[PDB]
């Protein structure tokens, strides 16, 4: 394993945070 | 407690993906 699963979900979460941040500041 | 975290992140990631989808075109 469950720790590996959380690691993968967090890695994905951080990638999506930064992508939204880039897209928010860009259009807004 | 770990499986609780998995569900928490799934929902968070889903909402983030929905923002990415909208804020792309818009």
């Amino acid at each position, epitope marked *: 394993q469950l720790e*590996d699963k959380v*690691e993968e979900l967090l890695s994905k979460n951080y*990638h999506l945070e930064n992508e939204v941040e880039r897209l928010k500041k860009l259009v807004g | 407690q770990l499986e609780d975290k998995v569900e928490e992140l799934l929902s968070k990631n889903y909402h983030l993906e929905n923002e990415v989808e909208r804020l792309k075109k818009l």
Partner: nanobody, 120 residues
Framework: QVQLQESGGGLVQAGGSLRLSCAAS????????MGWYRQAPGKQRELLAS???????NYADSVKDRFTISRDNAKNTVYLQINSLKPEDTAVYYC??????????????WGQGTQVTVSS
């Protein structure tokens, strides 16, 4: 607690390449994501690449085939190979250590970064 120190940057001709190093001090937690970001002056910070404890990697699409993240075979050190550098790649490159633990919750630690300056 965790403390990171980047190195390997500096001045470089366009067309060159660098291996940046992030040396990690302190506890290596069981849930951890090491990431490389960069920030140009004025611009927003940009996640380039991530690696988990088990070696699973995650790249920003724009650099997936030019930059490569990896971990030393033995040392508590992660690397970012940045190839085919162009003036647009000038920035401070930062390392970060991020995750969650059943005991203390979310954590997030930043290096101070290494400046890369690509000249032409």
């Amino acid at each position: 607690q965790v403390q990171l120190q980047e190195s390997g940057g500096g001045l470089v001709q366009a067309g060159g390449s660098l291996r940046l190093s992030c040396a990690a001090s302190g506890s290596i937690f069981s849930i951890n994501v090491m990431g490389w970001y960069r920030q140009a002056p004025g611009k927003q910070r940009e996640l380039l690449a991530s690696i988990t404890s088990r070696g699973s990697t995650n790249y920003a699409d724009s650099v997936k085939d030019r930059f490569t993240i990896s971990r030393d075979n033995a040392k508590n050190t992660v690397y970012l190979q940045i190839n085919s550098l162009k003036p647009e790649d000038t920035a401070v490159y930062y390392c970060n250590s991020r995750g969650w633990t059943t005991t203390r919750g979310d954590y997030d630690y930043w290096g101070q970064g290494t400046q890369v300056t690509v000249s032409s």
